Amino acid sequence: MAILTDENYVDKAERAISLLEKDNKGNYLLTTSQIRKLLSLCSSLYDRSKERKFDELINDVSYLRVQFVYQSGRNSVRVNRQTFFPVKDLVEKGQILEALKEIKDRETLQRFCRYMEALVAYFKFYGGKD
Amino acid sequence: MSIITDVYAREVLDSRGNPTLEVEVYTESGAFGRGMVPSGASTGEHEAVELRDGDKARYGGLGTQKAVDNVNNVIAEHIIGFDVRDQQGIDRAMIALDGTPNKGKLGANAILGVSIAVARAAADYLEVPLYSYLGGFNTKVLPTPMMNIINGGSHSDAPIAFQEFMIVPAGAPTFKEALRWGAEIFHALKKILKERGLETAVGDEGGFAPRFNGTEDGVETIIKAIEAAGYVPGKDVFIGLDCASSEFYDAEHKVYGYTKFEGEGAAVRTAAEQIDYLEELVNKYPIITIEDGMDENDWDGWKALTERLGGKVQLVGDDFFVTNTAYLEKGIAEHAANSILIKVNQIGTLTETFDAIEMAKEAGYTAVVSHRSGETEDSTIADIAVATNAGQIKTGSLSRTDRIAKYNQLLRIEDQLGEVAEYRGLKSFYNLKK
Amino acid sequence: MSIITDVYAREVLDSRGNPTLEVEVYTESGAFGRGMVPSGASTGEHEAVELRDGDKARYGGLGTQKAVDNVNNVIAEHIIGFDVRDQQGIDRAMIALDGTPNKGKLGANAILGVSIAVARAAADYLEVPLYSYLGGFNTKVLPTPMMNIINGGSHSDAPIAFQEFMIVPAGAPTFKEALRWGAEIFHALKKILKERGLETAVGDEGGFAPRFNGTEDGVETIIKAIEAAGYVPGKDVFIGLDCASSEFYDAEHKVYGYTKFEGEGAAVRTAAEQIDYLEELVNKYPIITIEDGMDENDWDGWKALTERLGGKVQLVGDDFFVTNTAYLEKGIAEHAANSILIKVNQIGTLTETFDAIEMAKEAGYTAVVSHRSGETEDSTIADIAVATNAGQIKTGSLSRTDRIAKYNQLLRIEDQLGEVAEYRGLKSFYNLKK
Amino acid sequence: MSIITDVYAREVLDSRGNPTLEVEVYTESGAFGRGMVPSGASTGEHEAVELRDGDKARYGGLGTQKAVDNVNNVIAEHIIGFDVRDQQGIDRAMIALDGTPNKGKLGANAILGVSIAVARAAADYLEVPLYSYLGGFNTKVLPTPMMNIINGGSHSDAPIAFQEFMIVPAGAPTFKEALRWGAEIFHALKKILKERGLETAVGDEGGFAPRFNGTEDGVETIIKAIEAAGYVPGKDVFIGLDCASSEFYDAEHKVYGYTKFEGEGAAVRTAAEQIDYLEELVNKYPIITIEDGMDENDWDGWKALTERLGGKVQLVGDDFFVTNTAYLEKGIAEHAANSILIKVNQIGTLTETFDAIEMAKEAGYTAVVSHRSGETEDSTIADIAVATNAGQIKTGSLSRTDRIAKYNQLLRIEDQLGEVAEYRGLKSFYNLKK
Amino acid sequence: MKNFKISSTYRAARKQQKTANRKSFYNDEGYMISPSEWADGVIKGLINPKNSWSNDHVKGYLPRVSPRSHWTKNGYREYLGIGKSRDIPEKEPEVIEMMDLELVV
């Protein structure tokens, strides 16, 4: 049983980012600067999955996972004496780590990178800031 | 040295067992002041409102922890660092910090407690009496008291529409003698009621609430008590009324319905019928004061009452004005009433209280410093009355310490003043001719 | 610096309209103390007497100008020059200057006023709280209050022979919570009496005196009010009684005639039947206190009552001991009662009050600091109860500032004590087993 | 100016030459207080333990550098900034800082030294005597001394099982006369021992430890010396015993074996036989106090002894209660003993010492403030005894200034109190009857 | 801050220049706000009342702070930080050889 399939990842990203925490004014707490490194690493992993075999990209996925955990744990936004952690909220509401656990070949890796594409696309669609 | 270093509120109990708050102010040199707030009303359209908790679990929703928190966390940060003698600056800073006309955010009780505590701490620092600090060097007039002696209306089961009946010992030479006369009349009335078989226990202000036949019977028994004490009604001791006609006024019919308190068969009186009813009461009995004889919204009736009886009888607007500068200005413009009842927590600040007193005095009106139904051991209103040279006070009966505290403070003020102290009596009713 | 410079007395009014006196003490550095005297009794076989004028033309013979002159012209010339911290020396000097066992030459009211004023001035000079000055550094125990809630006997027209009823919130965690519980039960009882059509006006102590059917009716209504407020009788709030059996005791027939208050059908009991009635009341209701259960001169009855009920209920001697060291020692010798009602003006000075408290504590008795019928805005008995760590106070109901002032002072003392403040509740009844 | 700014500690010597620590406290204005700690025990299941170095090369492992370092580096940073008059707050903060029921981390000796230094600095700051600061304005009772005259048990080689014998001059008019009587009886007994050829050198507590024949011979010699000085035994001077029955109690056989100290043909007595022997001794001699007459864990024997001799003989529990609040609760509940020996270093805090004293007083027990085997020139226990009005002290014999210091402090206190000072004498045994 | 205390000259300057009568208030982002909105935010919990206001400005370059004193073991007064200031000379420095360096006059 996989959480990401070719028939649901775009709608999954839709629902995942429509549930992200918002300020009292309605703006998203997440910004593109907080996830810029993760997006760059996902883009590079997608680029390198086309040429090289999956066994060569065994350290890149692990680096991507440790980057996801580090960024989710370190990014904090404080408004109105309340501190939220938008990257961790995005990771748990998008099931990023669980999807990363189901990466075992080129197909699943490319599906995950397309899922991240969809996540940031729809984040920008609903008023996400740079 | 005089810089405020600590402002701290705590929740205490008022005279009815309901919560209120007290504020303590400490300055740098160790001067200390404590202000206790009387219990007012938390809801009001054009009056200052007190902040209540509303938590039904604690004190029936009447806790004052929110106002205490507002003092400790909001007012304390702003006020600490001010000079303790900067009463007007502190009061204006609190008014600006609240930001609302009705003082509903901070709570009027919070602001009043801080104001009184600051004034008392400044008087302590200067080592001067509180009336000297508040009113300057020319503070000498001892107020004439309106001693509430009989209760009716919504405070009694008796068929009497009028809320309060009072004795005014305006014929006494000194305030000490006036207090003695009032105590003796109070005890003579107690004996008369015990002989008559009526209820003797006291109410909120210390006055009796017997089962009389009506208003006339209550005034006659008050006069009998005065004569039993050995004083001449109309020369030594006079009668005042607090009708509180807003309680039994039908707004939609524009008629003062006396049937609310005097049974189904009571006479139902319109505006002019109320006017000449009050005139008949004034002619029959030695009445010097009538308070709230018209509804708070019957401006034409108030103007007709002032035209008819304003030259010889003091007409006090309690609910008519509600210690509001705008309403008092309007009443002065339209020649409505000739006296205002001043309640400190209805406006919530000492500066605004003194502004209202000064505005009333400038128009020929008399300002009557008044007590609330739920009082404390704090007797600042006595110092306010002496400081303003108002010449009239209304602080209750001769029974409970919530009322006796102000009389004791006035006795202390008279003793301190010595030969300078003046009790004017009838001359303190300067709003009346002759 | 601490040398007493000025001692001045004046006449003020108590919480009944009757005169009393207050004394002000000034030292050389500007330390100020004020002591007001509660009104007591000028007639007593072995209790200290207060000095009244007896002039029927002034206050009905209750003026206190004689005691004021005694302070101003006799005590002041003797005490001025003493160190303000010499409380024991000043009190001994005043007792010697009186030279009379019941303090009739100078008046016990004058001596008590000077004692309280000197103690408060000494506390003001040392910049310590009054309880710290009086009791030392280890003052932490907030008293358990017996809040009077229902009256009878000579204070009511109801057929209840017992003088008054109290609620004891001994299950509360803090004194703040105990005060809130007492206030909520008071308001619940007020609502219940309103539903039943009974009277709502308060008496001298602040408590209701409705027209109940009998003692059991009043106790059951108290239990109903406790349960309506949301508290468990016998675990959170207990019931105490002041029978004041000296009122309805027939000295010649050696019987307790309830017919004086409960009508012609009341039961005339002997000492044994009275003890049986008290025991069955204790077994029927959650009663933890009985005050003046027997007559002040029925020593055999007191001994039998202590043998029967003294293990599980507190037996307080109010008229039995009249705050007397000789009587208290005699009672300790014969195992009569297990508590004494400490009235500060029944003995005369603070030194003698503290001697009586410490003798009772050493004998295993509990000392209950008590109010008088005529109280003031002075709240020194709260500081006495905290300073001695007595653990019990009887300062009236929740309806008048003469009583609420002591509760507010106890709230202030608890606030300053902070984390070291102790409310023991049931553990304050150390005269009982388990 | 009352804020604690400096806390220093240093290692000094006690009366036996073993190390102890002393603490000094300086406030901002310069108020100074020094506290010296008596030598206690670092072992015990339910007692506060002192902290020792354990370095066998230095003082045989009895150094106190660890506790001094704890005061200088741990306690001082926590306590600096407190008000010096916040004794309860400081003591609670230090108890929390230790975090251990027996104060084993910081050391009970360190905590007691800081407590005493803080109390003395606060008394210096307020410019009041130490007993006035500790016990308030009502501090007048000069304690009755039970002073050691003859030793035995483990402090002597004579065949006497009982540890200590004391004289109690309870018939003296003043404390000065009682001290003179004790010193004269001490010198007369010295003369009698010199005539008999026995030894004259004094032990740790200052009393003689001669080679007598038994308990009866020792008490007979004490009575002979009392009569030689010129005082009536049983009227002017009484005898007291410190059996220390734990030292010759066999736990396995549940028997009191006198063979440990009294030889080989010594009687072996059960609990009932021990009670009979003590009752026979009390009937034979004017013995008024017996201390540790039973084992520290023999609760049934203690209860039976209090049943038999508790009405006429004061029974003190030293090892029985170990001045522990919980053991005192259990003893009061179980009717075991009627007096507690109060040692301030077995608790480690003045606040808890005073708590134990008033708790014992509330039960009808007497608190006897006691010294330790290794004392200092500090005489705070005398001020404690006067402050609590305990009326009993046990501070040693008349031959070393580790005891004469406390006796001189009591002489100074009696001189300062003047006419107020009271020596109750035989009345100070309020735990007895008649 | 225990080694030093507020100077009396600065306290007098602040007292009778009335700088505490002209406080400025800030929200949680450190932006100036009116006292009404500051009170409203503090009541609502959106502003910490402690670190959100300023006591104007005192003119004249006065020293704000003076050394605090304590009592030594013999009862003499001493500055708190004078005697525990340092114990070792921190070793140091390092003499870097840079003879080849064109200096500028």
UniProtKB/TrEMBL annotation, chain A:
Domain of life: Bacteria
Gene Ontology biological process terms from the UniProt entry: defense response to virus
Pfam families according to UniProt: Csm2_III-A
Record key words, sorted: Antiviral defense, RNA-binding
Xref: CDD domains: Csm2_III-A
Keyword Phosphoprotein attributed: no
GO molecular function: RNA binding
Stated role: This subunit may be involved in monitoring complementarity of crRNA and target RNA.
Membership in a protein family: Belongs to the CRISPR-associated Csm2 family.
Family matches, as NCBIfam families: cas_TM1810_Csm2
Protein name in UniProt: CRISPR system Cms protein Csm2
The species this protein was found in: Streptococcus thermophilus
Encoding gene per record: csm
Automatic annotation (TrEMBL), chain E:
UniProt-annotated stretches for the region Disordered: 1-21
Bias type Polar residues, positions: 1-10
Annotated Basic residues bias: 12-21
Highest rank taxon of the organism: Viruses
Protein name, per record: Uncharacterized protein
Native organism: Streptococcus phage CHPC1156
